[PDB]
Amino acid sequence: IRDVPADQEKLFIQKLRQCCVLFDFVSDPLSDLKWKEVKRAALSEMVEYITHNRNVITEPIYPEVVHMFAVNMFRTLPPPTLEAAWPHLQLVYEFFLRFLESPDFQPNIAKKYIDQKFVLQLLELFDSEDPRERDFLKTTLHRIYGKFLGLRAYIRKQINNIFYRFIYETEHHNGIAELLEILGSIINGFALPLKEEHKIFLLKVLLPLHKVKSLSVYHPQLAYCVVQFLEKDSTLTEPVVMALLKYWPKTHSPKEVMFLNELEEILDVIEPSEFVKIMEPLFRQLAKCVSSPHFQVAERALYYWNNEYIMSLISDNAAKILPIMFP
Amino acid sequence: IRDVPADQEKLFIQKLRQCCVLFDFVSDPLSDLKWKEVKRAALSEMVEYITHNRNVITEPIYPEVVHMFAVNMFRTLPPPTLEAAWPHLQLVYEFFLRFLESPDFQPNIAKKYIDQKFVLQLLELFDSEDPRERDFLKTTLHRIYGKFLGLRAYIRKQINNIFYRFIYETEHHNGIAELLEILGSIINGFALPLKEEHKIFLLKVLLPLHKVKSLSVYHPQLAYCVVQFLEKDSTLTEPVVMALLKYWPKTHSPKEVMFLNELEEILDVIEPSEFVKIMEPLFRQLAKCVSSPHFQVAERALYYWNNEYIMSLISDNAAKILPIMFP
Amino acid sequence: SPAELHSFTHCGQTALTLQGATTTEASNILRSCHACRGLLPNHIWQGDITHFKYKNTLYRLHVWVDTFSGAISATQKRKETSSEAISSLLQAIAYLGKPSYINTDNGPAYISQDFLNMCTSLAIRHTTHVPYNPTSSGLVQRSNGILKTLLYKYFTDKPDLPMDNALSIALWTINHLNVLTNCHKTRWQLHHSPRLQPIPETRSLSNKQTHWYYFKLPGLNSRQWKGPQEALQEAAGAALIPVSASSAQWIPWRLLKRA
Amino acid sequence: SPAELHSFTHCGQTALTLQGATTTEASNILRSCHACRGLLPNHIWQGDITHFKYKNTLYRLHVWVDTFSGAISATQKRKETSSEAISSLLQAIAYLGKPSYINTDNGPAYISQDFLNMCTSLAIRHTTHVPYNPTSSGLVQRSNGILKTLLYKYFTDKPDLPMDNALSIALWTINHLNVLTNCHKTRWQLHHSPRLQPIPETRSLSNKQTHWYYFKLPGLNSRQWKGPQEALQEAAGAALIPVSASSAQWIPWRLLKRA
Amino acid sequence: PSPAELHSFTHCGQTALTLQGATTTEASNILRSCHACRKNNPQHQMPRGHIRRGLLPNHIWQGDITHFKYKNTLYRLHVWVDTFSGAISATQKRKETSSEAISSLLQAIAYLGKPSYINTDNGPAYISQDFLNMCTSLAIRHTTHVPYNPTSSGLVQRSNGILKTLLYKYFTDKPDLPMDNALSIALWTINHLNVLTNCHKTRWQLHHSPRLQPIPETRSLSNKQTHWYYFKLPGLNSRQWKGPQEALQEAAGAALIPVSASSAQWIPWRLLKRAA
Amino acid sequence: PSPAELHSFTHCGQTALTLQGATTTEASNILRSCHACRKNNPQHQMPRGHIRRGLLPNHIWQGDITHFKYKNTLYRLHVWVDTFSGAISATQKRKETSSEAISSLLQAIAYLGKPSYINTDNGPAYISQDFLNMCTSLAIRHTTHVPYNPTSSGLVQRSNGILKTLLYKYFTDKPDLPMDNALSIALWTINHLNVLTNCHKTRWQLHHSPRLQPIPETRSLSNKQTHWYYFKLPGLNSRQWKGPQEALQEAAGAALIPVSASSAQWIPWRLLKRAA
DNA sequence: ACACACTTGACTAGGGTG
DNA sequence: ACTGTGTACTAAATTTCTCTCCTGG
DNA sequence: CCAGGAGAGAAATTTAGTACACAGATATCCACCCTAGTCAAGTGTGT
DNA sequence: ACACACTTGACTAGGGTG
DNA sequence: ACTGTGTACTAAATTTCTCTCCTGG
DNA sequence: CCAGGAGAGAAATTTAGTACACAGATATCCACCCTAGTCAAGTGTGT
Ligand SMILES: [Mg+2]
Ligand SMILES: [Mg+2]
Ligand SMILES: [Zn+2]
Ligand SMILES: [Zn+2]
Ligand SMILES: [Zn+2]
């Protein structure tokens, strides 16, 4: 069964809706596989048809497409794993993404069809362990959040919920990075002076986050977050003073030395105005962590007599650090 | 004295009108020749100024230019001779001709300024003996007659007057050919059926003209007139039959053999419908002029067994000329 | 110039004062160098072949002469077969003009079909003379004798000339710098006076125009055009549109509207 | 093909079923030819020189390996002066990408003023590694050893192949057809993923457009255009204007309106 | 007809015929059956084929080899360019072997990308047997342009000119530096620091992102109807037109004419002239 | 810096500058201070000085000499044209010595008409002292063109093309007829039977009738102000631009200018890359 | 058992396209 | 002191007309 | 019953807009790769 | 009257533009 | 079976703005 | 007393519209005319 011809959107909403039969595909495909391949070919035609023309996307289908979405993948996952039916979910995805950024998508119409419980029935999918879908899900969320406002701040609160529930105990959510990137896209798109809510929820949970362990799996992107955080918001750097320092680890580990590698790659936007009050509490740990039990601190604690301007800072306003720096 | 500057046609009508001093130039130029050359230079500038621009020729000058014309050459001539002051009259002429066919000459305005006694005070100049002016006068008359209607038929009658007064006695007018050409231009520009007036004044004076002698001086052009007369009007050929024949000369002379050369160059538009009634009165002189006193008629009267279609005519309808053509 | 133009050209007495010499100085030019079937309006021709004084070998002057105006066009060659009696005619036709009645004589070079096999292919009535009809000689011979005497006027002085330039120059003088009778017209300007336009009745108007049209590129810029204006001149090349500067120019033009 | 693309390049177990082989067809392919300073995203680099077991002469090859993605670009020379390390870097930088923080040990080819006289010209913070700092060896040497292995897996067969193609092919496989972790991304894919556009606040829109373009010239006629509506593609070349025929084309294009 | 055989005796322009007195349309008919008067004026109104190639996908490449800097060292370079996204890879040193060309292609694959078609000139270093054996060892097609037609490779030919006069710039200045790197530099430029038209992307990044897109398709070429037409031998032997009777097999931009040797040939339309 | 001098290390395009983050127009300033970038990119935006003479009523002949197909023998044709009415006179047989060129002029003058100026190229048969003495003996001027510049004589060079392909037409048909009278034929059908152009007047008429017209006036080549131009030697020696300092006597279209030989030529503007 | 009836070969020559 | 140009060839406008056959004088 | 008349060819007929090539001309060399012929080393017969 | 001082020339040589 | 193209260079539109300084709230 | 506001630069900054040249490469010949020197017939010294 296939077509391209009367050129009636009704016969095409038929082609769309007629996928309303659903396969149970855990281990039993033997019963008439052909409905499966024909479905794949159907959606193939559907996608390049949407690329074909302009007037294809009128109202009578909007809640149907969003329903066909929900019916096609809105279900649980078993809490490095991939999908048997993968190229099928990989096509419902690519079809939806192209559907979203299609030119003729008017938001004022879809506003009632975009739903808050819907998007909650979307974000909980990031907990899965397929990286591939965890990509399509990344990009699609980035398009929604770029294309709506109410749900924009709504999801902001929803994720802060997840944040809380995650950091305070041992959630192996294993799908965090994809939001840390949607975050970075946001924290770039700002203009201060503004509401403190953002920076507040950062000093609330973002930095306390480092109480967490296994940091290798989310360290780079969070570092790129904190730097996208500072620029220009960076004058908001005065209160960052000692935050990680109190959240400093206690035992001997390459965790600590990775966090050193971090701290080494963050002293970049210093400005001497408030830098008066911080060079001392800086050295109150940096010059005072030689007592660490690593065998590396022998050249760890002394990586700052070597920069261009960090050294010139050691010779800029040294009227207060001069006796403390070991002669 | 000269100029080109305020760009006021009043200062240019001044330049024009200030030629209002007139030279008596029979034999006495000694008195301040310089006014003469400066005049020549003046009109030179005037001419190329008229070639220069568009808006130069407004009303306030029209009767002035025609007056300056009349005052400059409307005078008697001594009844192969040329002009001492020639390049001066040759410039008032060329200036006027270019003035006439200038684009911005509106006839509806100059209609009251073009005058019938004026044109009579122009045509009587053709009697002169300078060929050069007899050329400029030719062409200018041809422009007038092309650019007016009332005076058109008027001058037609005026010349028919001249015709009469000329042909009936021994007028040595010596300036005829120039009208015979303006005639030919007219007789081309016709569309019969029409008023017989034209053809009437032709059978009235045009062919009777050949009573005249010395024909060489206007013979070619008149031959070209009579042929422009016939074509296509030529079916109007039926009545031309015997006209010259009765106007045939009487004595022995190269006049007659020139008229033979004519008659030889006129048998070109025969059509057998009315040609029935004429081939006989044709041969009633052609075959019957062997009695001429020339020594040439021995091969003069027999130049017609030799054509392409004249011979085929002798073999087309010979059912009436067969015994008369000498076997 | 007049004494050199004299010896270079060197025709005659009449047409020299129109270059700047006075009456008596023209006669004193004569005193100088001590060596000096109808009328058939345009294109009903006549022609002839002629011998010539062998410098050491006689050449065959082969000429055509109009009968209305009196122009001349001829050439030089050795043989006299219809091959080249043709080539002579054909050249004269590339000169002026294109005839309709060719009467020269009953010569074999005219007898050959090679001749008629060319004439007929040009729609050219061939009317040929009655042989030995010198009643037209005193005139065609007037022309030919002119050619003769002019040639010997050339190379009796400076016999170093080849026999081509002598003919070229002989013509260029005989057909631009002479007036026959009081007509005060050269053979040439007469033979090419643009004929007077015949006048229509009841259409007593005129059409001397081509509609206005835009213009650019006097100088050194590309932009929108200007005007338009009428154009009061024209020629292969430019068209002399009167620029808005109350002045004139010449440009290879842009548009041609209807007028 | 997959058994041949293997013998062509000698990949392993993972990245072959994505060309059409099943699970066991990958393990049996292994049974065929048996037993044969943080993360710093993007561009904060690191590099090194290495010797190499000869064919008969020890080839000295430098290399530059990214630290965020894990790509590699390198070459082989005979001499190892500063002019050499220079030409090596500069080539890798015409390979991808253009860094801003470069690191190395303190060999002589890293000391010379000319080297400095080039680094400074490119706004490139050139730091110094601590010489003999093998805490980064397990990863750099992970790469280097990869190369060493692959090369010997190449020329242990058909040893007559020249000693450069072995390098070219070695790369083309090591940088288009591998993933080590579960990232399911080739090094070279990852290293050039167009970065996600950062969303601006309070203007939740986008700009992806250029409106008509009067189009013509699908085929074989010059005439007025057709009103050319949007372009959903673009490239040096043509732009995919959707023809009113409900069909698509590719043309080098005429107009550019605002959008 | 005095109109017609007049043209058949002088070959004068139609306007002259009109003034002789025959209507324009009959004139226009005459001036398209004076076969000589047709075989001589070179005027060439066939429609241009601007069709260097379609590029639905990426990866239909193009090859060409060039001589640089013959002050003392002829400096032979090979270039391959891609014609979806105008990206250039270029490797010289001197030689011409098949083995050299092969080593160059094999190197360009390490740069981007890994093609699926190819086409170059007629060849010799490309016509080698072992060359095509390397091709087939990589599951790649291969094609050759018509012989003796330089514009055929218009794209590359232009990208060559772009590359030379960038080198020349550098070598006016700094006239000592070795070519190995003054080339590596001129490449990093051509790829990363320029833009083309309102496309307004850097060739490279355009070559990277959009492959996320699908591929339209147009196939099943049809509607073949011959014609007849005299033009010209394509051996640069420019002369009067060369008349053939008629196309054995039509094509799209090209044609196929039996030369009197009863041999197939593929003339491009930029060399033909239609007849009855 | 990185904005400013980057061009001074790569010579990248202005767009690349602004997009790396430089300014908007001082870019444009930078891209006119790289003597290298100017000595290398070729372009002649200098205006198309394109003009003959001819204002006169048909009195500048402009005539050159050329070759012809050999049936079995070359045929030299000299041809002089006019410049206000495109009328052509042409005399050939084999020889291109001075004395024959002279006899050609002396013939093509009988056919209308005696000139007042003349123009040609540097051909030897024209540089002859004897030709010159003949000219002067006839009260004519004479001029040459800058050497090595064929376009200079565009008009006649084209009327040549016109005459050849008319001959070829005839000799396609009737391929026996003698190779001279078919010239007198072509000369007819070029002067009398062929409407020129939009002017719509056969050359012959356009050449006779309008002599009745006067002469407009234009004068005063004046207002000299120099400049500097680095462009290219005009000896077909196409290469990088050839830079001098600067004009000595600018004139209409062309420009006097000294080469380093302290010698002065007149480079046609069409080879000058303006830089002040 | 070695002289000849039988092969390659190497190795020119020549041609064709850029 | 000095400088590109004229014709051929085909699609498209545009302008005649032209019978079809409608209309109320 | 039929003079102006939309009007769909239609036909006809003008106009517009690009391409092409005139220029002094050929021969000769060069880097490469393939096919076709020509003496120069190798092996089975007869008694 | 037979020993040398004075032109062309012829006659080479070479170059420059098409 | 097979087919020209991309950049440089300058005038001209056109679109920011911009103080001048007028106006009646 | 001064915010919108013609408005004349103005400045700035975009766009539009043509030209150019990548192609395998040089040497060698040819028709002609001019300028510069080189012995070779013709004529001037010393008696
Ligand atoms: Mg090539
Ligand atoms: Mg020449
Ligand atoms: Zn293996
Ligand atoms: Zn023809
Ligand atoms: Zn530069």
Numbering used by the authors:
A (entry chain E), B (entry chain F): 30 to 33, 35 to 109, 125 to 372
C (entry chain B), D (entry chain D): 1 to 36, 52 to 274
E (entry chain C), F (entry chain A): 0 to 275
Recite the paper's sentences.
Recent studies have identified a host serine/threonine phosphatase PP2A comprising the B56 regulatory subunit as the functional binding partner for IN from deltaretroviruses including HTLV-128. The structure together with functional analyses reveal that the B56γ (B’γ) subunit of an essential host enzyme, protein phosphatase 2 A (PP2A), is repurposed as an integral component of the intasome to mediate HTLV-1 integration.
In accordance with these observations, the cryo-EM density map shows a complex with the total mass of 320 kDa, including an IN tetramer bound to a strand-transfer product DNA and two molecules of B56γ. HTLV-1 intasome has a twofold symmetric structure that shares the conserved intasome core (CIC)10 with the intasome assemblies of other genera of retroviruses. CTD of the non-catalytic outer INs further contribute to the extensive viral DNA interaction, bridging between the two viral DNAs attached to opposing strands of the target DNA. The target DNA shows a kink at each of the viral/target DNA junctions 6 bp apart, resulting in a total bending of ~80° away from the intasome core. CCD and CTD of the outer non-catalytic IN are bound toward either end of the banana boat-shaped B56γ monomer, while the inter-domain linker between CCD and CTD takes a U-shaped conformation and makes an anchoring interaction in the central peptide-binding cleft of B56γ.
